C-alpha cells in the first residue's frame, strides 16, 4: 500500500492535539474568513455538559390498604420485635414502621453530606467541572468547603456518632441501597473525560408526632442546586431533622426494642471519615439501567404549596389509627410542577412507558433492577371545586424511590462561561418564543451527549402536539402499567424484607 | 436474599417480550385512559427507521494546475505505459487518465445495478424493510425486481461482459475503494435488528469525445429514491454511459495498453452473478468513522441548472490542450441546493468541523480514513454580476469524493404506514411554520437512532441563529481548513498511484 | 535566501512551487524522465534519503 | 538544502552554544518557525522528496 | 530567598532552551494543541513552582 510504503508522511500529516480536557467553552473558528456578516448563522460554540443530577426521593411504595407491601413488613417486623423478642406493648406495628423510615431518612442525609464532603478533594486537569460544578449540583457554595473542610468533616463525623443512637436493622436492603444510591459518582462511560451522574435526596421525611391522632412524616426541603449553602444550613436541616427524635420516650424504648431483638453486630453502621478518605467515580451498568428508565414526576406538595380545587394534597405518610384499622397510607397525588397552572408538557407522560434495555439477552434481575426509578401516571385525581388551575395524576404504584427533577451544569456559551443550571422533568415544554427553540435544543443536545440519559417527552406549545421517546433505542419493549406495578410489588417487598 | 427464596415470582413477573421487530409502525397505546381527550399531546406513536443511503460523487480531487496530485498521477501511469513498454502515440497522458476515470464511472454503475439485483434476496422475519426499503432508497421500482429478475440478471451480466472488456490497473487502489464502497451493507451496531447504511452513485462521468478542444467529462444524473425507474431507464443509462465509447476506434487502442502494460492479473474485475450471489450485511468500524466525520455539499451543477450570478459553474472535468497548459481541470462550487435561491442553512457549515472518533488512542490509518468524506468551505466563488440568487463555496480541497446529500427510510406516522424518504444535508433548515417543528424533531430522533450519524447543524429560521454538532462526542478535535487539505493531498495521492 | 533573512516555512514553500511551477506541469518531462528511469536502471538512479523524527 | 534545516535544529551540546541558532541563522531561515512548526516543516521536506523522486 | 529562573537576556539563555525543549516533548513528541507558545508554558512552570514553595 501507499500507506506503508511512506508512514512518515502520513504520520507527519495526521497529528492533531486530541483529549481535549472539558469544563470550558471552546471556540471551534471560522473555515470561512468572511462568514462574519452572518453572526448568529454559524454556530462556533461548543460545550460539553459535565455533571446530571438525579434529585429523587425515598418513598416506601403505594399504600392505600392494608395489604401493601409496607404494612405486611410493618407486621412482620413487629411480630419479630414484640412476640420473639419481648417487646414493650406501648406502640403499634406501624409507630415502628414510621419509625425505620425516620431512621431511612437519617441515613439519607449523613451519605449526602459524606458525599458533599468527599466530593470537594478531587482535583484533575482533564475535567475542570471536578469539584465546583458537583458542588453547585448538591446546593452547597464550594468557598465554604474550600475554607472549613475540617468542620466539615467533623460535622459528618458528629451526625454518624449521633445517628447510632437509635437502632436499625442491618439486614433490611432498604437502608443500604438508599446508601449506595445516595453516595456514588457513575460515569457514564469507561473514559477519563465522562460524565458523572449523581443522586441528590430533595425530600427527606421529618417526624411530627403530635397529638393522640397518629404520627405523621411530614415534607423536609433539601437545599436545591443553584443555592449556596453554607455549613450552618446544614447544621440546622440536622437540627431540624432530629428535632423531635431526640427526647422522646417512645422512640427511646423503640430503639431499646429493636437494640434487644437485632444485637448490636445486626444494626446498621455508618463508616467514620477522615482526612484520607476520598471517594472516585465507578462505572456502574446497572445504574444507567435504571437512570435511563427512569421518569419524572414533579416538584413535591407541601403544606405551603397553593393548588387551586386540590386542598390536602400534600406528601405525607399518615398514621391515623380511627381510619383503615391503622394502616400507613402514603398515595401521593403526581404531576405537581412546583406553581400553579396547568403545565401543558405533562400530557406526553400519559402514554405507556418504553422500557430500553442495553444488549440482547436481558435477567430477572436487570429487568427489575431497571425499572426502579420507573413510574406511570394511572388515573388522574380529581378536584374539589368547580375551578381547577393544576392537573395531577395518580400512578398505579412505584418503587422505593421516585424521580422529582433533573438538573444539568455546563458552561454557558456567552462570556465569561460560567456553570448553568438547568432543571428539567423528562417533559420538557417549548412555547410561543423564538429564544427557546434554540435553547431546547442546545438542551437537548447537551442530553445526548450523556450515554443513558432518560427519554424525554417534548412538548410544543405551538403545534398542540408532543413527541414520544427522544432516545436511541437498542431492544425495547413496551410496559403496561399493571405489570410496572407488579415489579414495583416486587422491589418494595423485597427492599423492606428482614430476616429473623 | 429475598430473591434467593422466591424466585419463581421473579422470574415470572418480568416475561416480557424484548425483541420487537423494526421495519412497522408501533402503537404503545394510552397509560391513562381519559388521555384520549388530549389529541396529539400524548404520542403513542413509535418508529424505527431502517435504512440511511449517502450518496456520494466519486472526483479526481480539485485540479486547478498541473501540479495538481491528479497530473502528477497522469505523468506517472503515462511514463510506466509508454516508456517501459512500447505504446502508442495517439493519445496524450491526460487522454489516458480520463479514459481511467470514466472506468471507475463504468465500475461503479456495475456495482450499483449488482447491488440492486443482489439486495432483493435479503429478507429476515426481524427487519420487515427487507428488501423494498433499500430498493426504495436506491432508486428502483421493487415490483419491477420481482416481476423481471430473469430479464435483471442478464442485464448485469451483460454489463459486466462489456465493462471487462476494456483494463484498468489493480494496482491503483481508486477502483478498489470505490467499488468496496459502492457495493455491500453496512450494520451501525452488529446487532439482529440494526440499521443499515449504503452508498449510491448521486452522478457519474459520462465519457464525450469532442475535437480539438477535448475529451471533457460531462454529468450524468442517476434516479433518486423518490423515481421507482424500472428496468428500461437503467438500459438507457448504461446505453448512453457508452453510447460514443464504444463506438470510438481509438478508445481500444489505449485499453489495450492497459492490459500489456500491467498484464492480465493486475487488472480490476468485475464479479459475475447468478441465482445464489447474495449479499449479506457486514460490521465495518472504519465505514463507521467516515460516515460520521462527512459533512455534505449539495447537489452537483448542471448545464440545465439555472444560476443567477455562476453561468459556468457546472461540475465538468474538463481537459483542454489550448488553455492552463493541456492539465485536467476540475474546480468545481458547492453550496447548491438544487433550487435557484439561497440556502439559508448552508451559513452552518462556515464553521470548523469537529473530528469525532471511538476508543483514546487513533493510529494515523483511521484518522487519515476517517477524513475521506468530509468537506469544508473555504471561501465564498465571487459571483459574476451585480446581483446573485444563490450563494456558493469554493471548498480548501476536497478529498476522493464529496457527499451530496442523504437520504432515509422510515415507516410512516399514519394509515398504512408505508415507506417514506427524508432528503437532507448535513445542514437542515427549519422554517417558522405550524408543522414544521415536531417534523424537525421526529427527523432528529431518527437521525439519532442511527449509531455514528453525521453530525447535524440546524437552522432555525424564527430565531435566525444556527446550531453546532447535534452528535454524541467521545474523543474530539478541532480541524482546520489546513490540516484537511494536508489530509486530502494525501489521500488523494495514495489512490491515484502504481507501484510497479 | 541570505542569513539576515529570518525567512519563515511559507517562503520556502512558495521556493519550492515556483522551482517545480512549469517543470511538473511540462508533458514532455515526464518522457524524458522515463526513458533515463528504463536506461540506468532502477538501481543505478539518485535516490533521496526520507526523514524522521530521529534522523540527526 | 532542506533536510539539513530541518535536521540542524535538533543539534545540542552544552559546551557549544551556537548549536543550533546560530546555523539556522546562517542558514537563512528563521530558528523559532522550525521550533514552532516542526510538523508542518517535516512533511514539507517528506514531500519535497517524494515530488524530486518522481524523476 | 526568591526563586528565579537565571539569568536571561539573549534566546541562549538555560531557561529560554529548557522551554524550548519541554515545548518539543509537549507538542512535537505528544500532540499538543498548538495554541500557545514554549514561553506560556515555561511561565506556567515557574507559577506551579511558586505555588508548591508556597504549599512547602
Do not use: C
Given at each position: 500500500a501507499w500507506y506503508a510504503r511512506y508512514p512518515h508522511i502520513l504520520e507527519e500529516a495526521t497529528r492533531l492535539p486530541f483529549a481535549y480536557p472539558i469544563g470550558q467553552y471552546y471556540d471551534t473558528g471560522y473555515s470561512v474568513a468572511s462568514a462574519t456578516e452572518w453572526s448568529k448563522y454559524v454556530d462556533t460554540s461548543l460545550t460539553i455538559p459535565g455533571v446530571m443530577c438525579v434529585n429523587f426521593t425515598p418513598t416506601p411504595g403505594e399504600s392505600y390498604n392494608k395489604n401493601s407491601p409496607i404494612n405486611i413488613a410493618a407486621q412482620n417486623v413487629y411480630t419479630y420485635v414484640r412476640h420473639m423478642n419481648s417487646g414493650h406493648a406501648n406502640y403499634e406495628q406501624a409507630d415502628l414502621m414510621m419509625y425505620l423510615l425516620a431512621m431511612d431518612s437519617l441515613y439519607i442525609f449523613h451519605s449526602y453530606v459524606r458525599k458533599i464532603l468527599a466530593i470537594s478533594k478531587l482535583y484533575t486537569p482533564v475535567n475542570k467541572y471536578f469539584p465546583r460544578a458537583l458542588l453547585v449540583a448538591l446546593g452547597v457554595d464550594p468557598e465554604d468547603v474550600?475554607?472549613?473542610?475540617?468542620?466539615?468533616?467533623?460535622?459528618?463525623?458528629?451526625?454518624?456518632?449521633?445517628?447510632?443512637?437509635?437502632?436499625?436493622?442491618?439486614?433490611?436492603?432498604?437502608?443500604?441501597?438508599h446508601a449506595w444510591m445516595s453516595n456514588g459518582l457513575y460515569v457514564d462511560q469507561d473514559v477519563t473525560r465522562a460524565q458523572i451522574y449523581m443522586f441528590k435526596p430533595?425530600?427527606?421525611?421529618?417526624?411530627?408526632?403530635?397529638?393522640?391522632?397518629?404520627?405523621?412524616?411530614?415534607?423536609?426541603?433539601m437545599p436545591k442546586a443553584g443555592d449556596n449553602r453554607k455549613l450552618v444550613d446544614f447544621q440546622v436541616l440536622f437540627n431540624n431533622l432530629v428535632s423531635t427524635m431526640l427526647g422522646d420516650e417512645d422512640f427511646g424504648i423503640m430503639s431499646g426494642d429493636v437494640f434487644k431483638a437485632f444485637g448490636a453486630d445486626g444494626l446498621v453502621k455508618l463508616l467514620a471519615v477522615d482526612s484520607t478518605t476520598m471517594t472516585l467515580p465507578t462505572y456502574d451498568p446497572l445504574i444507567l439501567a435504571q437512570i435511563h428508565s427512569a421518569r419524572a414526576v414533579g416538584a413535591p406538595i407541601l403544606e405551603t404549596s397553593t393548588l387551586t380545587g386540590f386542598p390536602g394534597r400534600q406528601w405525607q405518610i399518615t398514621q391515623n389509627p380511627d381510619v383503615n384499622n391503622g394502616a400507613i397510607i402514603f398515595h401521593p397525588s403526581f404531576g405537581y410542577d412546583g406553581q400553579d397552572h396547568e403545565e401543558l408538557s405533562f400530557r406526553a407522560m400519559c402514554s405507556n412507558m418504553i422500557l430500553n434495555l442495553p444488549g440482547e439477552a436481558h435477567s430477572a434481575e436487570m429487568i427489575i433492577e431497571?425499572?426502579?426509578?420507573?413510574?406511570?401516571?394511572?388515573?388522574?385525581?380529581?378536584?374539589?371545586?368547580?375551578?381547577?388551575?393544576?392537573?395531577?395524576?395518580?400512578?398505579?404504584?412505584?418503587?422505593?424511590?421516585?424521580?422529582?427533577?433533573?438538573?444539568?451544569?455546563?458552561?454557558?456559551?456567552?462570556?465569561?462561561?460560567?456553570?448553568?443550571?438547568?432543571?428539567?422533568?423528562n417533559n420538557i415544554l417549548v412555547p410561543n418564543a423564538k429564544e427557546?427553540?434554540?435553547?431546547?435544543?442546545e438542551l437537548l443536545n447537551n442530553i445526548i451527549q450523556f450515554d443513558w440519559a432518560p427519554q424525554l417527552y417534548l412538548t410544543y406549545g405551538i403545534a398542540q402536539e408532543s413527541f414520544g421517546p427522544f432516545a436511541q433505542l437498542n431492544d425495547w419493549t413496551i410496559l403496561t402499567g399493571e405489570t410496572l406495578a407488579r415489579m414495583h410489588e416486587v422491589c418494595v417487598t423485597s427492599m423492606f424484607d428482614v430476616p429473623q
Open positions: 474550600f475554607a472549613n473542610q475540617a468542620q466539615w468533616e467533623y460535622f459528618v463525623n458528629m451526625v454518624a456518632y449521633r445517628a447510632g443512637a437509635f437502632a436499625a436493622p442491618a439486614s433490611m436492603t432498604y437502608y443500604e441501597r430533595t425530600m427527606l421525611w421529618k417526624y411530627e408526632n403530635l397529638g393522640t391522632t397518629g404520627t405523621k412524616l411530614v415534607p423536609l426541603m431497571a425499572t426502579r426509578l420507573a413510574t406511570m401516571f394511572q388515573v388522574k385525581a380529581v378536584p374539589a371545586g368547580d375551578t381547577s388551575k393544576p392537573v395531577l395524576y395518580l400512578p398505579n404504584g412505584f418503587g422505593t424511590e421516585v424521580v422529582n427533577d433533573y438538573t444539568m451544569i455546563s458552561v454557558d456559551k456567552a462570556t465569561p462561561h460560567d456553570l448553568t443550571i438547568h432543571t428539567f422533568f427557546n427553540y434554540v435553547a431546547n435544543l
